[PDB]
């Protein structure tokens, strides 16, 4: 597992100006830990949560149906000892699905968050409030950071979980795959209670990545619309390698590949 660690050193590499917000992320409960359903707080929860419920069900049908034909063709090509969900649900729940989930959360909702924060400096809150001296960290970080990271690592796992729950629906409709053998097969193939329990940790680390990357670029953007799209370009560059560095390391360590 040394070559894996060699390739998995990308988690340190993509930290350009991000590291300035070190004590900025610390002091977000300094000036009174607020909580509740608020106007923007809930809209970020729609972007991360409510809308993503439909994304999860339909992208699960895109993945599921593609790997459902693969399952059939493995029977035809390789054989009966790795057929159907013996060697497909094995790779799908465990190592494959997690990457796409991170791209549709850390990528998609992370940049969306940034885009909204950028406009506080340009127009609605921070423009007037930093100048006065109304605590900047309490102003835009504290009530927007928490909104997009509480359900996020559960949702990252749910992405993959629904590929198994909906995988037996289309395992039956494409062929007739028994639901209980799919279920008991799944458990045994990945040793779920020790390996997939640790894949939950892998997805918490993915939530923790959103707390470093997204905040700084919204915090100090240039208040022009082109500077905002440059800031969203930067978050795609930052989040694309940080996730892959952990796809190397934690697949080998949390899952045990």
């Amino acid at each position: 597992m040394n070559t894996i660690a060699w390739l998995g050193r990308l988690v340190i590499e993509r930290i350009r100006g991000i590291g300035v917000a070190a004590l900025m992320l610390l002091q977000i409960i300094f000036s009174l830990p607020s909580a509740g359903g608020f106007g923007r707080f809930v809209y970020q929860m729609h972007r991360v949560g409510v809308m993503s419920l439909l994304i999860i069900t339909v992208s699960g049908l895109f993945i599921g149906l593609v790997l459902g034909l693969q399952g059939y063709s493995i029977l035809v090509n390789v054989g009966s000892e790795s057929m159907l969900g013996t060697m497909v649900s094995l790779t799908l729940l465990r190592e494959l699905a997690p990457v796409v989930a991170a791209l549709l959360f850390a990528g998609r909702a992370g940049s969306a968050l940034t885009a909204e924060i950028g406009s506080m400096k340009q127009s609605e809150q921070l423009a007037s409030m930093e100048m006065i001296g109304v605590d900047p960290l309490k102003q835009i970080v504290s009530p927007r950071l928490w909104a997009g990271i509480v359900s996020l690592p559960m949702l990252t796992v749910i992405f993959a979980a629904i590929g198994i729950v909906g995988g037996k629906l289309v395992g039956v409709d494409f062929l007739g795959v028994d639901e209980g053998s799919f279920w008991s097969g799944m458990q045994n193939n990945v040793q779920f209670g020790h390996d997939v329990v640790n894949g939950i940790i892998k997805s918490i680390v993915f939530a923790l990545l959103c707390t470093w990357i997204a905040v700084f670029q919204g915090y100090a953007c240039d208040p022009t619309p082109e500077g905002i799209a440059t800031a969203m370009t930067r978050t795609v560059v930052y989040s694309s390698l940080c996730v892959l560095g952990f796809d190397f390391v934690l697949t080998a360590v949390m899952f045990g590949g």
Binding site: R40, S123, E124, Q125, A127, S128, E130, M131, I132, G133
Partner: protein, 233 residues
């Protein structure tokens, strides 16, 4: 009591202020205006303590406030938009920033609810600045301006870029609200009515240092080729 002496600031590579000075009493309208890139809002940040000045002193009642904080020195100001929280409600606009600066439970419980009724904002408590009009937002802004009673009070273009109707209303309204004190006021603004009727002294800063110095009548008569063309007959 605001006293500034020989204030100079270079914003990176762009020189903004070459030693300037002024004397403005508590609760009076302030404003710096000119072409873009001459520091309209930079003075506000230097006095507030967001940017670090190079040379000179800024005194609050003859006290150095370079190392003092906003809450410690009781500083604040009103913004062109109104200095309100856009996401929050009108109730929450004046309930959020009263926790800082003299934290007190009886202050929050009593004053916040009653001062809104004393202005006429009882039926707008649950509405947001986006939903309200500019005139309705100005009424909340005026209430917020003296909510904390800062020792150091500045403004920023009270009614420069307003609607045809609203500008006419605010010209008389804000003047009459500041007339209660009627003290040494220094305004640099495009609006002639504003600098004529309210301001006592004018210190126009242009291209670094003070170019225009005096009363409206003394500065009728011109200071530079720019001013000669800018002012009309």
């Amino acid at each position: 009591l605001i006293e500034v002496k020989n204030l100079s600031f270079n914003r990176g590579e762009r020189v903004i202020y070459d030693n300037i000075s002024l004397n403005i009493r508590r609760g009076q309208i302030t404003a710096i205006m000119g072409p873009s890139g001459t520091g309209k809002t930079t003075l506000l940040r230097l006095i507030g303590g967001q940017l670090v000045p190079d040379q000179g002193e800024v005194l609050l009642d003859g006290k150095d406030i370079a190392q003092m904080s906003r809450q410690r020195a009781r500083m604040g100001m009103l913004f062109q938009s109104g200095a309100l929280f856009t996401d929050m409600s009108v109730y929450e606009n004046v309930a959020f920033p009263i926790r800082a600066h003299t934290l007190s439970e009886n202050l929050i419980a009593e004053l916040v609810a009653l001062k809104l009724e004393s202005v006429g904002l009882r039926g707008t408590e649950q509405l947001m600045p986006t939903e309200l009009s500019g005139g309705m937002n100005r009424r909340v802004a005026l209430a917020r301006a003296i909510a904390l009673d800062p020792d150091l009070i500045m403004y920023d273009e009270p009614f420069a870029g307003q609607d045809p109707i609203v500008k006419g209303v605010l010209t008389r309204l804000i003047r009459s609200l500041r007339e209660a004190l009627d003290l040494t006021t220094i305004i640099v603004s495009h609006d002639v009515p504003e600098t004529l009727s309210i301001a006592d002294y004018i210190y126009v800063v242009a291209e670094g240092k003070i170019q225009g110095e005096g009363t409206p009548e003394e500065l009728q008569a011109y200071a530079s080729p720019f001013v000669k063309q800018f002012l009309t007959g």
